[PDB]
Amino acid sequence: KFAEHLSAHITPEWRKQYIQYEAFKDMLYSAQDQAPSVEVTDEDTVKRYFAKFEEKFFQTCEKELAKINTFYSEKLAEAQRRFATLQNELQSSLDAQKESQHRNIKDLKLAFSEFYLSLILLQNYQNLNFTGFRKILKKHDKILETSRGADWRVAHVEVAPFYTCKKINQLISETEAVVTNELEDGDRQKAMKRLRVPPLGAAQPAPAWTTFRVGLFCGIFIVLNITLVLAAVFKSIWPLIRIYRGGFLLIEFLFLLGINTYGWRQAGVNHVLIFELNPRSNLSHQHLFEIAGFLGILWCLSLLACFFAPISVIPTYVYPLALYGFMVFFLINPTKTFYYKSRFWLLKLLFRVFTAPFHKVGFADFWLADQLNSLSVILMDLEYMICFYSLELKWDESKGLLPCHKYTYGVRAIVQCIPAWLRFIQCLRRYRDTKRAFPHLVNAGKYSTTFFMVTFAALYSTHKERGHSDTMVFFYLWIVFYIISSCYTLIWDLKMDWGLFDKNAGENTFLREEIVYPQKAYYYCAIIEDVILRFAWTIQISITSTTLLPHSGDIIATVFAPLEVFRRFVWNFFRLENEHLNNCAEFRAVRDISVA
Amino acid sequence: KFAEHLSAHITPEWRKQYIQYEAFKDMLYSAQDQAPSVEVTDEDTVKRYFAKFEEKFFQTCEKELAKINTFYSEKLAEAQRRFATLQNELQSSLDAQKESQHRNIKDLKLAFSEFYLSLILLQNYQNLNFTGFRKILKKHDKILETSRGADWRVAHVEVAPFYTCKKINQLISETEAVVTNELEDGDRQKAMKRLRVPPLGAAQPAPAWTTFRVGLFCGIFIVLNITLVLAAVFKSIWPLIRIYRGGFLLIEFLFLLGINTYGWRQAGVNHVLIFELNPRSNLSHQHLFEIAGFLGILWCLSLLACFFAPISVIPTYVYPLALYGFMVFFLINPTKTFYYKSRFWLLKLLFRVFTAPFHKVGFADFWLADQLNSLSVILMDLEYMICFYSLELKWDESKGLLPCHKYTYGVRAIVQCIPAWLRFIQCLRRYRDTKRAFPHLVNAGKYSTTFFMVTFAALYSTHKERGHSDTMVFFYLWIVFYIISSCYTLIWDLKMDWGLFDKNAGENTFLREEIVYPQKAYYYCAIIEDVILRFAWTIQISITSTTLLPHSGDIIATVFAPLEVFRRFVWNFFRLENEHLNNCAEFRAVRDISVA
């Protein structure tokens, strides 16, 4: 009907400021079903019941129209002030450049684009709220056989500045004119081609070729996985799983990111605005599903080529090497094709993460540097593969893949602490920037314990190998720091990265006041799953960096790795939801762009 | 822009009666690019050039508006007369049933539905033609800096009954009222749920779950085909290909039918109206792609299970049997699921084909009985599989599939002539119905030669096996009837089933005057391909029904079968296009339904 249409063209952050068409329909239906029968009753009581119901309905309409008009006036004042500011800024910039550049002009163009998008969203809100108001009043009129409905409509709704003001329309026209003149030297077409606003959020569908390709890649993937299982069961192996564990984690991750983006699109957790992508065009969930499926096809094919031996000229150790060489070349492809805009956004982001303490920390660069705390197994397996191919590989006999173990020399500890270091120094940069110690240093005191845990694990491993007597006290220190860097991380997650256990639970017990994901068992299952998978993950870390007996010293590492990429997949939902929820209380919908 | 929008919401049969926005834009752009420079020229000549161009533009607009108004008046008169007739019919039926039933009331409901659809199409044509007119005049105004454009607009276009008549709107309202009252006892909802008209033709997209499933099934299909090729090359066989040839032809056919339906949707050859499906909901191309992919997955899986031997309890001869048992059960599924409406339409059609001379021949029942002239190999292989499993199969030793040959007893000839017989008796029924001997008996004299060819082939086979002397004269008779039933069929195709080589070629040399498929090399490639594949197909028929040496007596039959399902796939395009072209000259867009 329409109650769905209000949930596909609504801008998510302005939720409570919209109509309450859902609640109005509930009120109407409940009053109708509750309204007793007059045929078995008197007249005065039932007609007074109708009267009081009408009065309550009208008071609710009063409050609703007042709220809508106030919010729209506030947003119009804000947009007018922002347009005045940006116009003065453009004027001053033009005068300065005439009296006396690319990075300035591009940012100015983008600021104008974001302002036009804010205007479009305000206009859409106006139109949708008016439509919902009209529909919910016509329904009441039809169900209560009353004529005063449209009378009071034309009296009060058809006069309010909520829709009887065309300032937004003339501002849109003025913005169009000013951009196409100043920033374009005429040629309205090349300006409008980017000023246009296609449907955003859950409204945009897939090009249907992307859904076909998702299907094709998932089908080939399923058949190759079944072929893999069958080949492995019918037709040592540790350097062959310790090399494809990296690819497995990186396929699982860019699918659980596809699932995450679908969850965000549906639930209304605006990730577009939070990451600061551009809201006109971005990657929906199917594009991530398709990238994950393609890289999974490549992984399965390389694994199969290792299992069988199709070509007798190419030795086996070229298959994983070629798979990862591809993966990297696909990521670093310089020609403008195969997701070029997206790969180069991601590459600039990865650079800004990896040289951390210099650039100002946004949100994408501490979502990614915090999500790289789950692919430490990928980094360790890549370090191990490099160690293999450069120090131990037989390089001959076409068997060197299936024939760098006592890593306690001080390399595996560092390559496992490197993402913890990235995030620690990012938080220190955030502190230097904000000059607020909380939360920016209590959070550094969460990643600063990973260093201590891994260092004590390595030292206890070395001392148990030696045979000293202080191995007991080192093991005790390690178990203390394990308990810490587990309970610290768990409390921190549940209390600041998701926001749960707030002072204002109320009906939503153990949760914040407003929850975006519909069913309330989700958060409880996630709480329990995180409490379990945050433990045993520090176990996996301390075990991949020790001298435990390789049997059951590595099976645990390869079992708990894709069971922790899952923990991160679950954590993503609620981190991004809590962030959206802190932007759904400031009524923000457009990435403030800062002219130069 | 819009020139595409006029090619996705246009009703196909009313093409020439629409605007000529394409031609108008060509005229404008050609006049602009042709308009010389006045700066290097005088004034009077160039301004007279502009004057004559304006006058020609206005005369073309005159002719266009006149044509549109005349056509709309004609269609409105027709729709009004039809509504009056159907209203009188409903009144009389109601009086009769009151004074004194399901098959009558359902057909009446369907007649009202089709009338409402005709009204909706006329309204859409009105709106789209007005929009195109407005746009093509605004473009001229903007490009010729003239103000008289909108003046003459409001003078002449904004007054014509082409859009200044709301008779269609009030007729739509009256139809809604009359249906929801009479045929529904109130309850406007259950009437509107079927009276509504969703976008038709090339406008409707796929549910995106169907495109995902097309992708999934095609991916699994591709991997299983590659596995098949590899298994066959690494790991006799004639009863194993002579049993899956049926499945192969029936997968190739329901894909080349998917491709056909896509070709029709795009090119505008309305197959919906021609087959008499209902225009609100029908099977797009992706649904046929998905059915073909599913049955292909099943075929590949059964073939693989025959190649390998996964389960040691189940003997090999159960795999093809189980595959075909499924295929049939999927077709005959009685529970309302898995394409229920579509499978039961097809089943009723197959019944009306197979008991041919009784039912009146429509078009679906002589498209299908004519398309079953290509799956005679399927019918023969099914007869052979029955012969196998009931007379020759070892039934033991788990090898009876890969260990009914001298079929000249008079069974394979009949099972190959049975589709020719269906079509021959269908054409005789069409003659009995129409009382016009052409074309209804010159077409019976085309399928009547298949009988003679197959009978002479069988008799010549028997006589060559015996050793008589009249085998020479029988071979000569067979070659005569081969030449006939080939050249007859070829001339008939090219001259009546496609309509080519018409008296009115003109610029479209060797073709009819109006061609729907855009590029003109299509018809020439198809002509050549049909001339080649109509020969050698009667060869395949005469060879599958003789005593040729099995080596190269059956390889030819299994090579020329999917090379003739392709010939039928090509023939479908142009048969349906010629039929649409004979309904694009009567301006028909709605399956006349005949109240009882």
Short mmCIF file of N, CA and C in Angstrom, two decimals, chain A residues 1 189 208 211-224 227 286, chain B residues 1 189 208 211-224 227 286:
data_model
loop_
_atom_site.label_atom_id
_atom_site.label_comp_id
_atom_site.label_asym_id
_atom_site.label_seq_id
_atom_site.Cartn_x
_atom_site.Cartn_y
_atom_site.Cartn_z
N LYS A 1 0.83 -1.20 0.00
CA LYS A 1 0.00 0.00 0.00
C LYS A 1 0.87 1.25 0.00
N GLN A 189 24.28 20.98 -18.82
CA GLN A 189 24.20 19.53 -18.86
C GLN A 189 25.28 18.88 -18.01
N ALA A 208 20.44 -5.62 -12.45
CA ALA A 208 19.93 -6.92 -12.85
C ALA A 208 20.99 -7.71 -13.60
N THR A 211 22.83 -8.77 -10.43
CA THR A 211 22.21 -9.92 -9.79
C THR A 211 22.42 -11.19 -10.61
N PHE A 212 22.38 -11.10 -11.94
CA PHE A 212 22.70 -12.29 -12.70
C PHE A 212 24.12 -12.75 -12.43
N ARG A 213 25.06 -11.81 -12.31
CA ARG A 213 26.44 -12.24 -12.10
C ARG A 213 26.66 -12.76 -10.69
N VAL A 214 25.97 -12.20 -9.70
CA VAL A 214 25.98 -12.79 -8.37
C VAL A 214 25.54 -14.24 -8.45
N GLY A 215 24.46 -14.49 -9.19
CA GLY A 215 24.00 -15.86 -9.35
C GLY A 215 25.01 -16.75 -10.03
N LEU A 216 25.60 -16.28 -11.12
CA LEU A 216 26.56 -17.10 -11.85
C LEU A 216 27.76 -17.44 -11.00
N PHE A 217 28.33 -16.45 -10.33
CA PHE A 217 29.50 -16.70 -9.50
C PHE A 217 29.17 -17.58 -8.30
N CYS A 218 28.01 -17.40 -7.66
CA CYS A 218 27.64 -18.30 -6.58
C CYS A 218 27.38 -19.72 -7.05
N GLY A 219 26.84 -19.91 -8.25
CA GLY A 219 26.66 -21.26 -8.74
C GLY A 219 27.97 -21.96 -9.00
N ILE A 220 28.87 -21.29 -9.72
CA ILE A 220 30.18 -21.90 -9.95
C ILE A 220 30.88 -22.15 -8.62
N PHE A 221 30.70 -21.25 -7.66
CA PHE A 221 31.33 -21.41 -6.36
C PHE A 221 30.81 -22.65 -5.65
N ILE A 222 29.50 -22.87 -5.68
CA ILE A 222 28.93 -24.03 -5.00
C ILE A 222 29.43 -25.32 -5.63
N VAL A 223 29.45 -25.38 -6.96
CA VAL A 223 29.91 -26.62 -7.58
C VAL A 223 31.39 -26.84 -7.32
N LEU A 224 32.18 -25.77 -7.30
CA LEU A 224 33.60 -25.97 -7.04
C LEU A 224 33.85 -26.36 -5.60
N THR A 227 33.08 -30.06 -5.52
CA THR A 227 34.19 -30.77 -6.13
C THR A 227 35.39 -30.82 -5.21
N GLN A 286 24.95 -6.40 -3.55
CA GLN A 286 25.25 -7.37 -4.59
C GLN A 286 26.64 -7.19 -5.16
N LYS B 1 16.94 9.80 -22.52
CA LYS B 1 16.10 11.00 -22.56
C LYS B 1 14.62 10.61 -22.57
N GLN B 189 -12.27 -4.19 -3.90
CA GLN B 189 -10.88 -4.62 -3.82
C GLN B 189 -10.63 -5.88 -4.65
N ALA B 208 14.10 -9.92 -9.78
CA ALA B 208 15.50 -9.88 -9.36
C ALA B 208 15.86 -11.13 -8.58
N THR B 211 16.26 -13.28 -11.71
CA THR B 211 17.57 -13.11 -12.34
C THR B 211 18.67 -13.73 -11.49
N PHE B 212 18.58 -13.64 -10.17
CA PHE B 212 19.57 -14.34 -9.37
C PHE B 212 19.51 -15.84 -9.62
N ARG B 213 18.31 -16.40 -9.75
CA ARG B 213 18.24 -17.84 -9.94
C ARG B 213 18.67 -18.25 -11.33
N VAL B 214 18.40 -17.42 -12.34
CA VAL B 214 18.97 -17.66 -13.66
C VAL B 214 20.48 -17.75 -13.55
N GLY B 215 21.08 -16.81 -12.82
CA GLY B 215 22.52 -16.85 -12.64
C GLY B 215 23.00 -18.10 -11.93
N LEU B 216 22.33 -18.47 -10.85
CA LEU B 216 22.76 -19.64 -10.09
C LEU B 216 22.68 -20.90 -10.92
N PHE B 217 21.56 -21.10 -11.60
CA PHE B 217 21.40 -22.30 -12.42
C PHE B 217 22.36 -22.31 -13.60
N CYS B 218 22.60 -21.17 -14.26
CA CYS B 218 23.59 -21.16 -15.33
C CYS B 218 25.00 -21.40 -14.83
N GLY B 219 25.35 -20.94 -13.63
CA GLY B 219 26.67 -21.22 -13.12
C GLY B 219 26.87 -22.70 -12.83
N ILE B 220 25.92 -23.30 -12.12
CA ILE B 220 26.03 -24.73 -11.86
C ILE B 220 26.05 -25.49 -13.17
N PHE B 221 25.28 -25.03 -14.15
CA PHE B 221 25.23 -25.70 -15.44
C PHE B 221 26.59 -25.66 -16.13
N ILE B 222 27.25 -24.50 -16.11
CA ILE B 222 28.54 -24.38 -16.78
C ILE B 222 29.56 -25.28 -16.12
N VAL B 223 29.59 -25.30 -14.79
CA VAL B 223 30.59 -26.15 -14.14
C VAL B 223 30.29 -27.62 -14.38
N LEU B 224 29.01 -27.99 -14.41
CA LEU B 224 28.71 -29.39 -14.64
C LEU B 224 29.02 -29.79 -16.08
N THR B 227 32.75 -30.35 -16.10
CA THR B 227 33.03 -31.62 -15.45
C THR B 227 32.67 -32.78 -16.36
N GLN B 286 13.40 -14.57 -18.61
CA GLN B 286 14.20 -15.17 -17.55
C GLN B 286 13.54 -16.40 -16.97
#
